[PDB]
């Protein structure tokens, strides 16, 4: 019988939640495992396996301590790293990539400014706070 | 001072920052104003971003009326430590040196509320309150200053 | 034993006790003359120490 | 019983009853606003009994257990000025002024202590 | 049970006035 | 009292006022 003890320390769980968790859990694993029961199984050189936005080539250069078609390759490549290998890009219409691209760096550049005083005046900030 | 002259090697004397602090404070206590400044300047040369006790330097430099050195020291001290009461007391000493003193009183009381156990801030408050031509506030502040340090 | 006595003396200092704090600080300093905070506490409390005796022996 | 006998100007039995109260509570619970009151009332009785050493001892004990107390510091200043321990008297009196700047008697006590110290 | 806060003894002004006076004649003696 | 001002004025200022009666250092 399906085990539900760890999902709630209360030894009894009403049957609605039993299938609610069971059907929830299986597809959650099915998403991770496929791009069955939980209790039967949980399983399944540079050490670093993955970094968000890092491809296999970028991992290799780390181990070494380091026109329309071409820009479309850069168009998709830019969104590959930022969207963490999202599969919806290939379904996007080509002219819909352009406006999302321009908003990417424009939003990105704003981060650079954010990420980057006379004696009498700058003493007040500590007094008032 | 005689022990410094005799029992202290010169190389240790002129390189030790703590010895510089001690000799400067000592020569202040003998009211030797010229002697202390040229060693406190060496102290600042060795390290500018040190707070420890610039209360003595602020008291001296108010007497010497060197506004620019006080401005530079207050800037550096507060930019390093904002919460150290010594920085705020130096700032208030500078403000009293300038002219206005009510904001100096406010700065001093803020310095005290950083550390309630800093007697010299209290006594600087009390001495300043004489410049206000007010005695009752000055008297209470003097008593509260002497409370913190029994031997002052 | 060098640090325990000086810590206890510091506790007495925080409790405003002086005499027994002074004696415990002196004992801590006598255990090791390099401690240099027992001496500072004793100087701040105006106690008397036989520096020549403790430092030489 | 100790407090009422003290108020009745009959200190000797108040002293013994407060001593009994202290010895009953001596072994347990030094905290919890009970030993504090016991020791404070006992010190007041001793200071009114004109015996000062044990009163100073108990006042020191309660000051250890509670430092935020202007009345305690005023009482220590009183006891120390009763004796010739002027330095402790002025220290505790300045502590009391720090605890409460606007104290009526403490100003006169400080003036008298300073005058006596200077004349000494 | 709600135990009442025990009553505490106060240092009266009359006794301290008497003591400071006695000290005044004490220093006036010699 | 300030009952009238210059050139038939209405209100009146008072820039300064003071009262007088009869009767090196360490930091």
Instruction: Tell me, yes or no, if D67 comes closer than 8 A to chain C by beta carbon.
Output: yes
Which residue of E5, E8, E13 is in closest CB contact with D40?
E8
Please give the Cα distance from D9 to A54 (Å, whole number). Answer: 90
Residue with tokens 């110290």: D117
Query: Does residue D48 contact residue D74 with C-beta atoms inside 8 Å?
Result: no
Cα dist from B89 to B6, B15, B76, whole Å:
35, 27, 14
The string of DSSP codes covering E1-30 is --PPPPP-----HHHHHHHHHHHHHHHHH-
Residue E10 CA to its chain's centroid (Å): 8
Based on the number of CB atoms within 10 Å of its own CB, is B141 exposed (0-12), middle (13-18) or buried (19 or more)?
buried
Q: What is the C-alpha R_g of chain D?
A: 15
Please give the Cα distance from B127 to B121 (Å, whole number). Answer: 10
Chain D residues in contact with B119 by the CB 8 A cut-off are none
Kindly state the tokens that stand for D6.
């003290």
Please give the Cα distance from A69 to B77 (Å, whole number). Answer: 59
Q: Look at D119 and E27 and tell me if their CB atoms are within 8 Å.
A: yes
Please give the Cα distance from D20 to D2 (Å, whole number). Answer: 10
Please give the Cα distance from B32 to B24 (Å, whole number). Answer: 9
Q: Where are the alpha helices (DSSP H) in A41-118?
A: 56-63, 68-82, 94-115
Q: Look at B107 and A119 and tell me if their CB atoms are within 8 Å.
A: no
Kindly state the tokens that stand for A13.
């769980």
**What letter does residue D29 receive in the DSSP assignment?**
-
Q: Look at D109 and E8 and tell me if their CB atoms are within 8 Å.
A: no
Largest CA distance in chain C: 32
Chain E residues in contact with D6 by the CB 8 A cut-off are 9
Of the candidates B109, B138, B108, B110, the residue with the CA atom closest to the CA atom of residue B126: B138
Nearest CA of chain B to the CA of A119: how many Å?
6
**What letter does residue A106 receive in the DSSP assignment?**
H
Task: Say which experimental method was used.
Answer: cryo-EM
Question: For chain A, which residues lie within 8 Å of any Cβ of chain B, measuring from their own Cβ?
Answer: 119, 122-123, 126-127
Q: Look at A127 and B107 and tell me if their CB atoms are within 8 Å.
A: yes
Instruction: Tell me, yes or no, if B110 comes closer than 8 A to chain F by beta carbon.
Output: no
Q: Look at B147 and D95 and tell me if their CB atoms are within 8 Å.
A: yes
* Burial A40-64, CB ≥16 within 10 A → b, else e: eeeeeeeeeeeeeeeeeeeeeeeee
Please give the Cα distance from B65 to B138 (Å, whole number). Answer: 24
Interface of E with D in 1-30 (CB under 8 A): 5-11, 13, 15-16, 19-20, 23-24, 27
Based on the number of CB atoms within 10 Å of its own CB, is A5 exposed (0-12), middle (13-18) or buried (19 or more)?
exposed
Interface of D with E in 46-85 (CB under 8 A): 48, 71, 74-75, 78, 81-82
What is the SS3 assignment for D3? helix
Cα dist from B7 to B4, B12, B13, whole Å:
6, 11, 10
Nearest CA of chain B to the CA of F19: how many Å?
17
Residue with tokens 């027994």: C20
Q: Where are the alpha helices (DSSP H) in D11-103?
A: 11-25, 35-48, 53-65, 70-82, 86-99
Chain D residues in contact with E5 by the CB 8 A cut-off are 33, 37
Please give the Cα distance from A32 to E20 (Å, whole number). Answer: 88
Of the candidates B66, B134, B53, the residue with the CA atom closest to the CA atom of residue B98: B66
Of the candidates B146, C17, B129, the residue with the CA atom closest to the CA atom of residue D101: B146
Q: Element (H or E) spanning C35, and its range?
A: none
Please give the Cα distance from B33 to A38 (Å, whole number). Answer: 82
Residue with tokens 């150290």: B84
Of the candidates C24, C31, C30, C28, the residue with the CA atom closest to the CA atom of residue C9: C24
Angle between helices B55-64 and B85-98 (to 10 degrees): 10
Q: Which residues contact C57 (CB under 8 A, 6 or more apart)?
A: none
Other C-beta atoms closer than 10 Å to the C-beta of D15 total 20
Among D56, D62, D64, which would you mutate to test the C interface (most chain C Cβ atoms within 10 Å of its Cβ)? D64
Among B117, B146, B149, B151, which would you mutate to test the D interface (most chain D Cβ atoms within 10 Å of its Cβ)? B146
Nearest CA of chain B to the CA of F27: how many Å?
7
Kindly state the tokens that stand for D5.
């006998």
Kindly state the tokens that stand for A6.
């760890």
Label residue A37 left, alpha or beta by phi (over 0 means left) and psi (-120 to 50 means alpha).
beta
Cα dist from A72 to A69, A77, A85, A106, A119, whole Å:
5, 8, 16, 18, 53
What is the SS3 assignment for C53? helix
Instruction: Tell me, yes or no, if B21 comes closer than 8 A to chain A by beta carbon.
Output: no
Q: Which residues contact B81 (CB under 8 A, 6 or more apart)?
A: B51, B87
Of the candidates A28, A8, A27, the residue with the CA atom closest to the CA atom of residue A18: A8
**Angstrom resolution of this structure:** 5.4
Query: Does residue B134 contact residue B101 with C-beta atoms inside 8 Å?
Result: no
Kindly state the tokens that stand for D81.
């000025």
CA dihedral E9→E12→E15→E16, nearest 10 degrees, is 110
Instruction: Tell me, yes or no, if D88 comes closer than 8 A to chain B by beta carbon.
Output: no
Residue D68 has, within 13 A of its CA and on its CB side, a CA count of: 0
Residue numbers followed by a gap, chain A, C–N over 2.5 Å: 35, 44, 66, 116
Please give the Cα distance from F27 to B60 (Å, whole number). Answer: 9
Residue with tokens 């009390």: B126
Q: Look at D87 and B150 and tell me if their CB atoms are within 8 Å.
A: yes
Instruction: Tell me, yes or no, if D27 comes closer than 8 A to chain C by beta carbon.
Output: no
Chain E residues in contact with D40 by the CB 8 A cut-off are 8-9
Query: Does residue B24 contact residue B40 with C-beta atoms inside 8 Å?
Result: yes
Please give the Cα distance from D89 to D92 (Å, whole number). Answer: 5
Of the candidates B10, B31, B34, B13, the residue with the CA atom closest to the CA atom of residue B22: B13
Query: Does residue A12 contact residue A48 with C-beta atoms inside 8 Å?
Result: no
Based on the number of CB atoms within 10 Å of its own CB, is A96 exposed (0-12), middle (13-18) or buried (19 or more)?
exposed
Q: Report the residue count for chain C.
A: 57
Chain D residues in contact with C16 by the CB 8 A cut-off are 63-64, 67
Instruction: Give the CA angle between residues C11, C16, C22 to the nearest 5°.
Output: 70
Of the candidates C12, C16, C13, C54, the residue with the CA atom closest to the CA atom of residue C35: C54
Nearest CA of chain D to the CA of E9: how many Å?
5
Please give the Cα distance from F24 to F22 (Å, whole number). Answer: 26
Q: Which residues contact B83 (CB under 8 A, 6 or more apart)?
A: A126, B114
Query: Does residue D71 contact residue E10 with C-beta atoms inside 8 Å?
Result: yes
Query: Does residue C38 contact residue C16 with C-beta atoms inside 8 Å?
Result: no
Please give the Cα distance from C38 to C29 (Å, whole number). Answer: 6
Nearest CA of chain C to the CA of D65: how many Å?
9
Other C-beta atoms closer than 10 Å to the C-beta of F8 total 6
Long-range contacts of B38-45 (CB under 8 A, 24+ apart): B42/B14, B43/B17, B44/B73
**What letter does residue A57 receive in the DSSP assignment?**
H
Instruction: Tell me, yes or no, if F24 comes closer than 8 A to chain B by beta carbon.
Output: no
Q: Look at B143 and D101 and tell me if their CB atoms are within 8 Å.
A: yes
Q: Map chain B to HEC letters.
A: CHHHHHHCCHHHHCCCHHHHHHHHHHHHHCCCHHHHHHHHHHHHHHCCCCCCCCHHHHHHHHHHCCHHHHHHHHHHHHHHCCCCHHHHHHHHHHHHHHCCCHHHHHHHHHHHHHCCCCHHHHHHHHHHHHHCCCCHHHHHHHHHHHHHCCCC
Q: Which residues contact D18 (CB under 8 A, 6 or more apart)?
A: D2, D38, D41, D42, D45
Chains near C, with 3+ CB pairs < 8 A?
D
Please give the Cα distance from C40 to C49 (Å, whole number). Answer: 11
Question: For chain C, which residues lie within 8 Å of any Cβ of chain D, measuring from their own Cβ?
Answer: 15-17
Q: Look at B71 and A123 and tell me if their CB atoms are within 8 Å.
A: no
């Amino acid at each position: 019988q399906y085990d539900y003890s760890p999902f709630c320390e209360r030894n009894t769980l009403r049957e609605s939640r039993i299938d609610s968790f069971l059907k929830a859990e299986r597809a959650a694993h099915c998403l991770v495992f496929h791009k069955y029961r939980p209790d039967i199984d949980i399983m399944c050189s540079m050490l670093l396996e993955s970094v968000p936005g890092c491809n296999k080539e970028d991992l290799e250069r780390l181990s070494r301590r380091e026109r329309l078609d071409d820009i479309i390759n850069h168009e998709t490549n830019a969104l590959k790293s930022f969207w963490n290998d999202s599969g919806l890009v290939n379904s996007l219409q080509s002219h819909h990539l352009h406006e999302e691209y321009l908003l990417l760096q424009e939003e990105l550049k704003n981060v650079y400014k954010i990420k980057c005083e006379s004696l009498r005046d700058k003493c007040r900030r500590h007094y008032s706070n | 001072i005689r022990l410094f002259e005799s029992q202290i090697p010169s190389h240790i004397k002129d390189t030790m920052p703590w010895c510089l602090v001690q000799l400067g404070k000592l020569h202040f206590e003998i009211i030797n104003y010229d002697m202390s400044l040229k060693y406190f300047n060496r102290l600042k040369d060795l390290q500018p971003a040190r707070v420890k006790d610039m209360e003595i330097f602020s008291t001296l430099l108010w007497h010497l009326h060197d506004k620019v050195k006080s401005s530079n020291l207050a800037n550096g001290l507060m930019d390093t430590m904002p919460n150290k009461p010594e920085t705020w007391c130096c700032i208030g000493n500078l403000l009293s040196l300038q002219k206005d003193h009510d904001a100096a009183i406010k700065a001093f009381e803020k310095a005290t509320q950083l550390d309630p156990n800093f007697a010299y801030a209290y006594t600087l408050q009390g001495h300043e309150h004489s410049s206000n031509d007010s005695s009752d506030s000055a008297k209470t502040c003097y008593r509260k200053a002497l409370a913190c340090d029994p031997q002052h | 034993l060098a640090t325990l006595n000086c810590l206890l003396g510091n506790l007495y200092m925080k409790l405003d006790h002086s005499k027994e704090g002074a004696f415990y600080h002196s004992e801590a300093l006598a255990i090791n003359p390099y401690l240099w905070e027992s001496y500072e506490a004793i100087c701040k409390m105006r106690a008397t120490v036989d520096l020549k005796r403790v430092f030489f022996d | 019983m100790g407090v009422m006998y003290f108020k009745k100007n009959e200190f000797v039995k108040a002293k013994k009853y407060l001593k009994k109260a202290l010895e009953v509570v001596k072994d347990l619970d030094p905290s919890s606003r009970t030993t504090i009151s016991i020791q404070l009332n006992l010190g007041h009785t001793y200071r009114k009994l004109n015996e000062n050493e044990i009163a100073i001892k108990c006042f020191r004990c309660v000051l250890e257990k509670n430092d935020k107390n202007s009345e305690i510091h005023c009482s220590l200043g009183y006891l120390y000025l009763k004796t010739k321990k002027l330095q402790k008297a002025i220290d505790h009196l300045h502590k009391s002024l720090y605890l409460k700047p606007n104290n009526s008697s403490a100003t006169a006590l400080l003036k008298n202590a300073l005058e006596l110290n200077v004349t000494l | 049970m709600i135990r009442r806060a025990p009553t505490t003894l106060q240092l009266s002004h009359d006794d301290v006035t008497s003591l400071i006076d006695d000290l005044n004649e004490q220093k006036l003696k010699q | 009292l300030f009952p009238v001002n210059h050139e038939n004025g209405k209100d009146t200022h008072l820039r300064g006022i003071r009262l007088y009666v009869p009767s090196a250092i360490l930091r």
